[PDB]
Scaffold this active site. Structure first.
Site, PDB file in Angstrom:
ATOM      1  N   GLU A   1      54.146  42.850  84.678  1.00 36.56           N
ATOM      2  CA  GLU A   1      52.892  43.472  84.307  1.00 36.56           C
ATOM      3  C   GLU A   1      51.946  42.370  83.860  1.00 36.56           C
ATOM      4  OE1 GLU A   1      50.922  43.661  81.506  1.00 36.56           O
ATOM      5  OE2 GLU A   1      49.552  44.947  82.657  1.00 36.56           O
TER       6      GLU A   1
ATOM      7  N   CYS B   1      49.095  48.725  77.399  1.00 38.63           N
ATOM      8  CA  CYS B   1      49.972  48.627  78.536  1.00 38.63           C
ATOM      9  C   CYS B   1      50.438  49.985  79.010  1.00 38.63           C
ATOM     10  CB  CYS B   1      51.190  47.756  78.173  1.00 38.63           C
ATOM     11  SG  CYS B   1      52.222  47.374  79.612  1.00 38.63           S
TER      12      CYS B   1
ATOM     13  N   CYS C   1      55.005  49.709  79.655  1.00 36.86           N
ATOM     14  CA  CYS C   1      55.534  50.202  78.400  1.00 36.86           C
ATOM     15  C   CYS C   1      54.534  51.177  77.814  1.00 36.86           C
ATOM     16  CB  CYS C   1      55.909  49.079  77.419  1.00 36.86           C
ATOM     17  SG  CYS C   1      54.573  48.141  76.764  1.00 36.86           S
TER      18      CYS C   1
ATOM     19  N   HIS D   1      53.029  51.702  72.278  1.00 32.31           N
ATOM     20  CA  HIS D   1      51.958  51.298  71.366  1.00 32.31           C
ATOM     21  C   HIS D   1      51.346  52.509  70.627  1.00 32.31           C
ATOM     22  CE1 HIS D   1      51.772  47.032  72.400  1.00 32.31           C
ATOM     23  NE2 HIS D   1      51.972  47.411  73.660  1.00 32.31           N
TER      24      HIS D   1
ATOM     25  N   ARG E   1      60.901  45.830  75.718  1.00 37.34           N
ATOM     26  CA  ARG E   1      60.895  44.364  75.736  1.00 37.34           C
ATOM     27  C   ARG E   1      61.128  43.704  74.387  1.00 37.34           C
ATOM     28  NH1 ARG E   1      58.628  47.015  79.179  1.00 37.34           N
ATOM     29  NH2 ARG E   1      58.663  46.445  81.398  1.00 37.34           N
TER      30      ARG E   1
ATOM     31  N   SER F   1      56.218  40.698  74.241  1.00 36.06           N
ATOM     32  CA  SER F   1      55.916  39.610  75.187  1.00 36.06           C
ATOM     33  C   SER F   1      55.104  38.499  74.519  1.00 36.06           C
ATOM     34  CB  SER F   1      55.202  40.109  76.438  1.00 36.06           C
ATOM     35  OG  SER F   1      56.105  40.844  77.280  1.00 36.06           O
TER      36      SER F   1
ATOM     37  N   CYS G   1      55.176  41.262  80.075  1.00 37.96           N
ATOM     38  CA  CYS G   1      54.021  42.166  80.126  1.00 37.96           C
ATOM     39  C   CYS G   1      52.867  41.443  79.456  1.00 37.96           C
ATOM     40  CB  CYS G   1      54.281  43.442  79.339  1.00 37.96           C
ATOM     41  SG  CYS G   1      55.403  44.552  80.160  1.00 37.96           S
TER      42      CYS G   1
ATOM     43  N   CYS H   1      50.400  43.652  77.433  1.00 37.92           N
ATOM     44  CA  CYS H   1      51.039  43.776  76.130  1.00 37.92           C
ATOM     45  C   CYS H   1      50.850  42.520  75.292  1.00 37.92           C
ATOM     46  CB  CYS H   1      52.556  44.004  76.336  1.00 37.92           C
ATOM     47  SG  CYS H   1      53.010  45.719  76.217  1.00 37.92           S
TER      48      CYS H   1
END
Ligand SMILES: *S(=O)(=O)N1CCOCC1
Ligand code: SF4
Ligand code: SF4
Ligand code: FCO
Ligand code: F3S
Ligand SMILES: [Mg+2]
Ligand SMILES: [S]
Lengths: 263, 545
Positions: free
Chosen positions: B21, B68, B71, B75, B472, B495, B539, B542
């Site tokens: 991503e 994102c 995922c 968030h 992640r 990330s 990502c 992210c």
């Protein structure tokens, strides 16, 4: 035998990749059938095998294809500092999208971000993000929502390939999918009409499925087909007890906030 | 049996890194066919922390969810936990359960798509699948996985025929310029294994639709769920019988695919690439934990997460330290931010973008560099797996030992790109093994109690932190409220920990360290760089936000 499926170049600019994710939730057809049988998906960063210069070479091969191509754009275009805050292969996103747009047979903006600018354009817009039309002065077929239903995106792609440009509203959205307000098809409409509202999320009224207008629902000002087609064949936000955010409307991050109020 | 390696000496840049991503440029210096230095350069800034300033704290989760869409949800969850903490509300038990099940569904969706659709093309030569004998492939599949009709010779042949028609069409699409085209020494698998994996890659495209539909029963939709509110959740229907029956049925189908296809494919691939258990290791691991039984405070989340929290340093599995939330900070020395921003705890976070130029080794990324007590930390499935295994978490002990015995490797072999990849599968199996228990818990709780959102009031001034272990790794959102509005909102994302640049002392991030020692069989097709980078499941939307 000489064969050709229509070439699609898909660019990712200032995006969250939720629109790519939405697209692969399609079931009519599933994404494998679409890319094996209906289109030739010739550049798509999220899923393509090539990387680096090999990926950039694949993009150039697609852009130079003698059969032409359709352009799908995911994400807004960050324009500040000469476009340098969003780059792929050392090139500003706005430069590559401008080049691709110039020779495209048609341009489909998947998501509110490519259509109108989206989340990164919200005030104070640090990167000076713009929608594709806003930045480039080109007309686009807009499939907004954050993300749009795959039904609307894949439906628009198939329409473009088989019938032509679908009738678009003044915000560039196909009326086939965006011609009706969310509210007009909401199963809570009889509560709305009877002024039967949930005053809070913990209320017995909320438990009973009363209308969410007092909790900020933007269904009455949002054009989308969410209650009609659902997401993932199972649900949509109001059915899950939450107000609509207005996510298929231009600049909704600023025009529909605060989300839990009627501003 | 030696790992293929050229004599190449020189620079390699890979931009775009595809099958992640977001927008990442990796630069490496190579000498005699091995990487000797590396830079992880994130190439897009959006500035969500800036955008949030002055807004209603209730709106934060809707903006931050758009950090994102791979995922998705996580968030919205971290922001909701963060604002719940800031307003000092304890969510009802049902809301803890529902939020945690939606996280479980996300792990299943996300890890399945990662293995097949992002990572597998680094290990699997799809074109070689056309050379396989489908009967031999069916026999092999029968020896390494449960009997299933999708593994029949007839089914595998149908896949081969589809792929043959596509390759012969002259439009290779997503396989255009693939690193495996024409053969590549770093690709080891027998054609039969390529065919089995390719068949499952196609099946996984259909199965991920079902995993997303499960998630949407509770989440409202996928991507971008819409069922969380300050104080809990909104989805009363998700506590009820028929929806939960459908959620269980779909989750069982998905888990059958995890157990029948993902784990056996992962172990088959791992068996052929055992050399990759000695490439790509790092030393320090962090997790905030996930699937807690008490989410009434960040401290209780840390303490009661069923996938436990902790810190490991120097590969020492004999000791797991408690997470000190006060010890987290972010540097910007090697990032595209203004000077003066080093060493900031996220409650004091500053996001002041300042670009220089491409490949400026003094400032080469839009990610900040999160550090913990001065050290870089790897986060994600491997971190969770080592922390849980070290603590004797019984599901992780069982499933890890199963993998160690199948591959004839010690736990130490997991400090590697193969290990990182294996851990992602291990924890997917463990989430699957717990779905029925978690679903029954919520079904029984929802049948007796329909409290789903607690009452709360917005404080004039407060601060709060929301923790989650997303697919992640360790995710935290940190708010300062002033005048009932957002005064500061900082995201520190997995990330960011894994793929950010060097910190203030010039110390490499986990992906930069992991890349040191990578062999390069062909510098024009550096699949080995992709194997390690993809193993961290990057990502960049992210990581930068
Ligand atoms: S609200 O402003 O009351 N709402 C009511 C009906 O349609 C749009 C706006
Ligand atoms: S429209 Fe929404 S889901 Fe799509 S890229 Fe933009 S932020 Fe992501
Ligand atoms: S819940 Fe929203 S869309 Fe449904 S009737 Fe009420 S205002 Fe309209
Ligand atoms: N998982 C995930 Fe996305 C990243 N990195 C977040 O948080
Ligand atoms: S938030 Fe968006 S997805 Fe539909 S219900 Fe409202 S337009
Ligand atoms: Mg941050
Ligand atoms: S084409």
């Amino acid at each position: 035998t000489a064969k050709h499926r229509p070439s699609v170049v898909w660019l990712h600019n200032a995006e969250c990749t939720g629109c790519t994710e939405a697209a692969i939730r399609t079931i009519k057809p599933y994404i494998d059938a679409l890319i094996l049988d209906t289109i030739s998906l010739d550049y798509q960063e999220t899923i393509m095998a090539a990387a680096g210069e090999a990926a950039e070479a694949a993009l150039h091969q697609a852009l130079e294809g003698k059969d032409g191509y359709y352009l799908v754009v995911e994400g807004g275009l960050p324009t500040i500092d000469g476009g340098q805050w969003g780059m792929v292969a050392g090139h500003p996103m706005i430069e590559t999208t401008k080049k691709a747009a110039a020779k495209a047979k048609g341009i489909i903006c998947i998501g509110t971000c490519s259509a109108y600018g989206g989340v990164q354009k919200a005030k104070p817009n640090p990167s000076q993000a713009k929608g594709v039309s806003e930045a480039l002065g080109v007309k686009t077929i807009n499939i907004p929502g954050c993300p749009p239903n795959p039904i609307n995106f894949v439906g628009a792609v198939v329409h473009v390939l088989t019938k032509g440009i679908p009738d678009l509203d003044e915000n560039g959205r196909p009326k086939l999918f965006y011609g009706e307000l969310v509210h007009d098809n909401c199963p809570r409409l009889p509560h709305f009409e009877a002024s039967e509202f949930a005053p809070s999320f913990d209320s017995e009224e909320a438990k009973k499925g009363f209308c969410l207008y007092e909790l900020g629902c933007k269904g009455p000002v949002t054009y989308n087909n969410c209650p009609k087609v659902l997401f993932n064949q199972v649900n949509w936000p109001v059915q899950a007890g939450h107000p609509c955010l207005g996510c298929s409307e231009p600049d909704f991050w600023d025009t529909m906030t605060p989300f839990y109020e009627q501003g | 049996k030696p790992t293929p390696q050229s004599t190449f000496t020189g620079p390699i840049v890979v931009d775009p890194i595809t099958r992640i991503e977001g927008h990442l440029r990796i630069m490496v210096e190579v000498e005699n066919g091995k990487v000797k230095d590396a830079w992880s350069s994130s190439q897009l800034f959006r500035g969500l922390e800036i955008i949030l300033k002055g807004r209603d704290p209730r709106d934060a989760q809707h903006f931050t969810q758009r950090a994102c869409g791979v995922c998705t949800y996580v968030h919205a969850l971290a922001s909701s936990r963060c604002v719940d903490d800031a307003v000092k509300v304890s969510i009802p038990a049902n809301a803890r359960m529902m939020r945690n099940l939606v996280m479980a569904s996300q792990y299943l969706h996300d890890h399945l798509v990662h293995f097949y659709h992002a990572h597998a093309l680094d290990w699997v030569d799809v074109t070689a699948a056309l050379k396989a004998d489908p009967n031999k492939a069916a026999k092999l599949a029968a020896s390494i996985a449960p009997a299933r009709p999708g593994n029949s010779a007839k089914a595998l042949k149908a896949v081969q025929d589809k792929l043959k028609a596509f390759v012969e069409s002259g439009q290779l699409g997503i396989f255009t310029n693939a690193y495996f085209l024409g053969g590549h020494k770093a690709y080891y698998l027998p054609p039969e294994v390529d065919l089995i994996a390719t068949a499952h890659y196609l099946e996984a495209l259909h199965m991920q639709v079902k995993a997303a539909s499960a998630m949407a029963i509770l989440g409202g939709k996928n991507p971008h769920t819409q069922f969380t509110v300050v104080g809990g959740c909104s989805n009363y229907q998700g506590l009820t019988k028929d929806p939960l029956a459908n959620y269980l049925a779909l989750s069982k189908e998905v888990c059958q695919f995890v157990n029948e296809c993902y784990i056996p494919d992962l172990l088959a691939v791992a068996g052929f690439y055992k050399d990759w258990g000695g490439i790509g290791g790092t030393s320090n691991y962090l997790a905030f934990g996930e699937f807690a039984t008490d989410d009434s405070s960040p401290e209780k989340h840390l303490a009661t997460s069923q996938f436990p929290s902790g810190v490991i340093t120097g590969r020492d599995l004999g000791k797991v330290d408690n997470v000190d939330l006060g010890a987290i900070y972010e540097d910007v020395k090697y990032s595209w931010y203004a000077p003066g921003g080093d060493g900031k705890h996220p409650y004091d976070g500053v996001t002041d973008p300042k670009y220089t130029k491409l490949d400026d080794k003094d400032h080469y990324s839009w990610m900040k560099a999160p550090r913990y007590k001065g050290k870089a930390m790897e986060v994600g499935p491997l971190a969770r797996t080592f922390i849980a295994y070290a603590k004797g978490q019984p599901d992780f002990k069982k499933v890890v030992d199963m993998v160690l015995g199948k591959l004839s490797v010690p736990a130490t072999a997991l400090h590697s790109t193969l290990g990182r990849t294996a851990a992602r599968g291990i924890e997917t199996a463990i989430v699957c093994a717990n779905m029925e228990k978690w679903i029954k818990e919520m079904a029984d709780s929802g049948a007796k109690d329909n409290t789903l959102c607690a009452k709360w009031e917005m404080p004039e001034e407060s601060k709060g932190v929301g923790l989650a272990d997303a697919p992640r790794g360790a995710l935290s959102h940190w708010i300062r409220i002033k005048g009932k509005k957002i005064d500061n909102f900082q995201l520190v994302v997995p990330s960011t920990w894994n793929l950010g640049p060097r910190g203030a002392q010039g110390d490499k991030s986990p992906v930069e360290e992991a890349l040191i020692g990578t062999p390069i069989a062909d510098p024009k097709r550096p699949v080995e760089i992709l194997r390690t980078v993809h193993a961290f499941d990057p990502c960049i939307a992210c990581g930068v936000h």
